[PDB]
Amino acid sequence: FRKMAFPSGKVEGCMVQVTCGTTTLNGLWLDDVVYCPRHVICTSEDMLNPNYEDLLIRKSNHNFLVQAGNVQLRVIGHSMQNCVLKLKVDTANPKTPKYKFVRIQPGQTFSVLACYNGSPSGVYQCAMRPNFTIKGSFLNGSCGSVGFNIDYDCVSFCYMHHMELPTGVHAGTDLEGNFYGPFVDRQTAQAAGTDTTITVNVLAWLYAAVINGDRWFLNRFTTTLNDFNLVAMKYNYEPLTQDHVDILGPLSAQTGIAVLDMCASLKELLQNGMNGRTILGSALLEDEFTPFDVVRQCS
Ligand code: NA
C-alpha cells in the first residue's frame, strides 16, 4: 500500500527560478505574479537577524532575476505579503492551472514538488505534522518548493518551504506568507515543540489494511472513546474527536468495522506493540494517510 503523490505536471509549468543579489531559490509563477520566500533578499549574514522591511527597501524591481527555463521575466512591481515576496511581472504564465490558495490543518496531507534552482527534481507525498513541521527532503536550493493538492482540475496550493530548523525538520508558510506553527524566517534556534501521532490517520491506515487483506490486528475487545483517548494521551497520540469518527464513517461502512472497535484494536496495538509482525508491510504505525487519501486510493 503505497504513498501516492498527485500528478505534478500542472505545478511543473509554474516553477521558476528567482535570483536576488546572490541568493537564488524557487518561485511559483501564477498569472502575472511570482511568489517566493522573502528571504531570497537575504545574504547568509542577513539571515541571522533580518529586518525585512529595511532589507526590501534597498531592492528595486530590476534587482530580481526571475527566469522560467529560458525566457527571462520583466519584473514591474514588488510587494511583501507577510513572509512571501510577490513579484508582479509583465507576462502572465500561459500554463497557469485553475488554482486556489488554501491553509490546511495539522494532519492533512499534500504533495511537494521539490525543485533545485528552478527545475523540478522529484515529487513526494507528506503530512503537516501536528507541530506544524514536515519531515522531508529539502536540500540546498529547495526553498520556495510548493506543496499542493489537486481536486479534478484545480490546484489547491497549501505550502511553500522556507527554512530547515536546526533540528533538521522543515518549516514554511501558506501561499499568503503566514508560517505554519510558531516559526520565523530567521536563522535562530526555534523550538518545534512536542510532536504527536495523527490518530485519525493511523485508524484510516488500519482500514486500508483490512481492505487489503491484513486483519491479524482485529480484536475481540472493544472500547469507549474516553478509554481510548486515555490510552492515546499516554502514547503521544492526538485526541480522537467525534469529527474524526465521522470522517472515518465511509471506511467503517465499507469494511463493516465500527470506529470504536478499530480504536480498540489500536489500543491493544499501542499497549502491546506489533510483536515482530507487520501491517501492510510496515513494522510501525503509519500516520501520513488521511481518511480521504485511503478512500481516494481504494476507490
Ligand atoms: Na517501517
What string of DSSP letters covers 22-91?
TEEEEEEEETTEEEEEGGGG--TTGGGS--HHHHHHT--GGGEEEEETTEEE-EEEEEEETTEEEEEESS
- Among the listed residues 143, 158, 162, 263, the single catalytic one is 143
Distance from residue 197's CA to the centre of ligand 1 (Å): 15
DSSP-based three-state secondary structure for 147: strand
Q: How far apart are CA 20 and CA 30, in angstroms?
A: 19
Q: How many CB atoms lie within 10 A of CB 285?
A: 21
Domain hosting residue 264, numbered range? 199-298
Annotation says 39 is catalytic:
yes
Tell me which residue of 86, 37, 64 sits closest to 185, measured CA to CA: 37
Q: How far apart are CA 34 and CA 11, in angstroms?
A: 13
Q: How far apart are CA 138 and CA 105, in angstroms?
A: 21
Alpha carbons within 13 angstroms on the beta-carbon side of residue 232 total: 23
Give the pairing type, strands 154-164 and 98-101. parallel
Q: State which approach was used to obtain the coordinates.
A: X-ray
- Among the listed residues 20, 36, 39, 78, the single catalytic one is 39
Distance from residue 14's CA to the centre of ligand 1 (Å): 34
21, β-bridge pairs: none
Distances 198 to 9, 13, 102 between C-alpha atoms, Å:
29, 33, 20
Sequence-ordered list of residues with C-beta below 8 angstroms from that of 32, at least 6 positions apart, any chain: 88, 89, 90, 91, 92, 93
User: Which CATH number covers residue 242?
Assistant: 1.10.1840.10
Distance from residue 10's CA to the centre of ligand 1 (Å): 32
Sequence-ordered list of residues with C-beta below 8 angstroms from that of 166, at least 6 positions apart, any chain: 189, 190
Sequence-ordered list of residues with C-beta below 8 angstroms from that of 152, at least 6 positions apart, any chain: none
Distance from residue 124's CA to the centre of ligand 1 (Å): 17
Tell me which residue of 70, 149, 146, 69 sits closest to 109, measured CA to CA: 149
Distance from residue 94's CA to the centre of ligand 1 (Å): 43
Q: What is the DSSP letter of 14?
A: T
